[PDB]
Design a protein that fits this description.
The structure is cut from a larger assembly and holds chains A (60 residues), B (50 residues), C (99 residues) and D (522 residues).
Chain A: H1 10-26, H2 42-46
Chain B: H1 7-18, H2 27-40
Helix pairs in contact in B: 1-2
Chain C: E1 2-5, E2 17-20, H1 25-48, E3 53-56, H2 62-70, E4 75-77, H3 81-91, E5 95-96
The chains are: A mainly alpha (60), B mainly alpha (50), C alpha/beta (99), D alpha+beta (522).
Modified residues (Phosphoserine) (chain B): 12
Binding site for ATP (chain B): 20-21
Family (chain B): Belongs to the TCP-1 chaperonin family.
Chain lengths: 60, 50, 99, 522
């Protein structure tokens, strides 16, 4: 229900870009459990938490 | 063209394409190109510009 | 007479992602015993070594606060780093990293 | 229908090249006074307010930007010379500019790029051969004379740069600084610590290696700040409570296992500490942070620890001290360990610099220069870099040429007297080349506000048939054999100068027309 002709040049190229996108996005799925670190280390994650990664710093 | 293998023949031939550039020096580039191409050509059955 | 600590008064957690599997009410009582004995052994260690004053860099919990109180051993907590460093310098003692 | 896309244009023929020559002269005059011992300095201001001040012409040309093709050629040639030599960039840019100026009127009458290009190239070739043939050298191979002439060439470099009261002082300083280096002549093993306060004369040379003490947590100031023969271990390992490989997971079932695991982590830490301590080293350095527990342990064990050290610092540490970088401690032995006779955390102008000297091996140095301005210290450091470059090039080929404009007049005279046998328009154009070859001493004289015409006349008369090596002094304002004044600079600078000059001349004279896109890509 999507195929009329396949030029195999830009469309295989589309598979290539799509698979690169998929590997890039699924290589980052490492989280999913909110964690309880201690205040002793606190300086080490307020600053040494990775650049380019958002940190939702919840306090309660 | 006889062989496409000897160095002096390469100089004499390709210099003709070379006059379109660098009117003030010819033989130097001829030496460079002839040495490089004679080194690189397998001389048997095939070639790629790459 | 003072001892200088850089650690809180609480069952520490390791730096690695740790998962303690609990499947029995016996493990529940084991956890309860573990926390209570940890607090009491911390108190025994500190009060036993022969000091009167305690100082905590990163604070600690009110349970250990009352344990220090009714043990009649004065203590302080939540002090800046170089402040503690100069305190140890002046008193001539040593900052013990852990119990 | 328009043949080409709307918005474009093009200038052609004589008008185009005339505009290009004009641009060349406009950009050239912007540095008309920089070179020379009496040089007069310029400033630039950027939109960030980071005003920059320099008198070295190439850097100046980078500080400025154009959109003209010829001026872009000039600035890129300045880049090339600076990366090649690093001195006289003013001289090369200027000289090409007046060649183009001197040839400007020749386009209005019958003359073609062919003859002028051939004349330029052949004259450049002959003059480069002259450079090679009459370049002066020690030809002595003894280290005393070698060192002496290195310092003389250094002060020659300073004979057009900013400072003039510390010429021999800094020349000997840098010559020794490089003589405590290997034959690799690596450009990463030269530490530079700009120090606030302190006189310009107070700039010094650390025989060992010093650097800045990075931030440390509590528990410091109990460590012994002095040792009479410490041993150094060069690490790249972390001494902080960390998970194993950031992906390890722990699955236990009772509190006893939990306690065992945490105490086991502590045991890993303390076992690394035991390995370090029992290894015998007295100091540890690394890129990696040192946990407060390790610092408290080493203070309790009277040992110095420091982490988060930049790589180049550690590289200098290995290259001078004689140790070896470690990523592991399990195989720590004597051969890995470094060794020095002096460690101290000294105070140099309100700062905390860690000093490690007493190392019998020394293949890197860390300059400690003193001053009161970030910009003036930066300019002095830039001149130091220039001196480093000049000596590093010259240290290979110990053949030089006298500065002070003597050699330029020598070559101008050679071209002139030889340009009487060559025929026709080639002869006339080569004579124009030679006449353009007569400005740099004139520009030096007019930089100091001197009657350059008279000075050039007298020096030409003296050069003709009364001896060579006659330069212009500025404190004496006269002409004499100033080669024996020892203002001597390398000759590969001259050869590269001629190469770039011929390149530029033949390039811009080859210009005929340019089409300009509507540049919608903005």
């Amino acid at each position: 229900d999507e195929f009329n002709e396949e030029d195999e040049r830009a469309i295989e190229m589309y598979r290539r870009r799509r698979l690169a996108e998929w590997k890039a996005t699924k290589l980052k799925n490492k989280f999913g459990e909110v964690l309880e670190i201690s205040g002793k280390d606190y300086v080490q994650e307020v600053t040494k938490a990775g650049e380019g990664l958002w940190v939702i710093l919840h306090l309660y | 063209a006889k062989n496409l293998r000897d160095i002096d023949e390469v100089s004499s031939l390709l210099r003709t394409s070379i006059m379109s550039k660098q009117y003030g020096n010819e033989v130097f580039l001829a030496k460079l190109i002839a040495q490089a191409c004679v080194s690189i050509f397998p001389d048997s059955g095939h070639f790629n510009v790459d | 007479k003072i001892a200088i600590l850089t650690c809180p008064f609480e069952p520490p957690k390791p730096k690695t992602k740790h998962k303690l599997d609990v499947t029995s009410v016996e493990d529940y009582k084991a956890l309860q015993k573990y926390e209570k004995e940890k607090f009491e052994e911390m108190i025994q260690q500190i009060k036993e070594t022969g000091a009167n004053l305690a100082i905590c860099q990163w604070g600690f919990d009110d349970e250990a606060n009352h344990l220090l109180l009714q043990n009649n051993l004065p203590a302080v907590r939540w002090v800046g780093g170089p402040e503690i460093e100069l305190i140890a310098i002046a008193t001539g003692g040593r900052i013990v990293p852990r119990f | 229908v328009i043949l080409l896309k709307e918005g474009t244009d093009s200038s052609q023929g004589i008008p185009q090249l005339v505009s290009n020559i004009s641009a060349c002269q406009v950009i050239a005059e912007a540095v008309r006074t920089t070179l020379g011992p009496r040089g007069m300095d310029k400033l630039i201001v950027d939109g960030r307010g980071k005003a920059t001040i320099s008198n070295d012409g190439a850097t100046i040309l980078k500080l400025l930007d154009v959109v003209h093709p010829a001026a872009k050629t000039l600035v890129d040639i300045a880049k090339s010379q600076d990366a090649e030599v690093g001195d006289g960039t003013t001289s090369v840019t200027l000289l090409a500019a007046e060649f183009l100026k001197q040839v400007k009127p020749y386009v209005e009458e019958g003359l073609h790029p062919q003859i002028i290009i051939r004349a330029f190239r052949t004259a450049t070739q002959l003059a480069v051969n002259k450079i090679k043939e009459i370049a002066v050298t020690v030809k002595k191979a003894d280290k005393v004379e070698q060192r002496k002439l290195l310092e003389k060439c250094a002060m020659t470099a300073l004979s057009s740069k900013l400072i003039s009261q510390q010429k021999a002082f800094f020349a000997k300083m840098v010559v020794d600084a490089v003589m405590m280096l290997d034959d690799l002549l690596q450009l990463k093993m030269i530490g530079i610590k700009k120090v606030q306060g302190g006189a310009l004369e107070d700039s010094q040379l650390v025989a060992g290696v010093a650097f800045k003490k990075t931030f440390s947590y509590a528990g410091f100031e109990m460590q012994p700040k002095k040792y009479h023969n410490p041993k150094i271990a060069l690490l790249n390992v972390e001494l902080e409570l960390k998970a194993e490989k950031d992906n390890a997971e722990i699955r236990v079932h009772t509190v006893e296992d939990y306690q065992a695991i945490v105490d086991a982590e502590w045991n890993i830490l303390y076992d690394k500490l035991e390995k370090i301590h029992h290894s015998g080293a007295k100091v540890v350095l690394s890129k990696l942070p040192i946990g407060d527990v390790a610092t408290q342990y080493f203070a309790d064990r009277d040992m110095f620890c420091a982490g988060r050290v930049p790589e180049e610092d550690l590289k200098r540490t290995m290259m001078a001290c004689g140790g070896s970088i470690q990523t592991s401690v399990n195989a720590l032995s004597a051969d890995v360990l470094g060794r020095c006779q002096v460690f101290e955390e000294t105070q140099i102008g309100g700062e905390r610099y860690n000093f490690f000297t007493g190392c019998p091996k020394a293949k890197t140095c860390t300059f400690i220069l003193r001053g009161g301005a970030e910009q003036f210290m930066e300019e002095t450091e830039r001149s130091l870099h220039d001196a480093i470059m000049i000596v590093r090039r010259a240290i290979k080929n110990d053949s030089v040429v006298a500065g002070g404009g003597a050699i330029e007049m020598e070559l101008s005279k050679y071209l002139r007297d030889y340009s009487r046998t060559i025929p026709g328009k080639q002869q006339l154009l080569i004579g124009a080349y030679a006449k353009a070859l007569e400005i740099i001493p004139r520009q030096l004289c007019d930089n100091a506000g001197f009657d350059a015409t008279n000075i050039l006349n007298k020096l030409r008369a003296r050069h003709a048939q009364g001896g060579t090596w006659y330069g212009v002094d500025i404190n004496n304002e006269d002409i004499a054999d100033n080669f024996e004044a020892f203002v001597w600079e390398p000759a590969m600078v001259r050869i590269n100068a001629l190469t770039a000059a011929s390149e530029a001349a033949c390039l811009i004279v080859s210009v005929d027309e340019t089409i300009k896109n509507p540049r919608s890509t903005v």
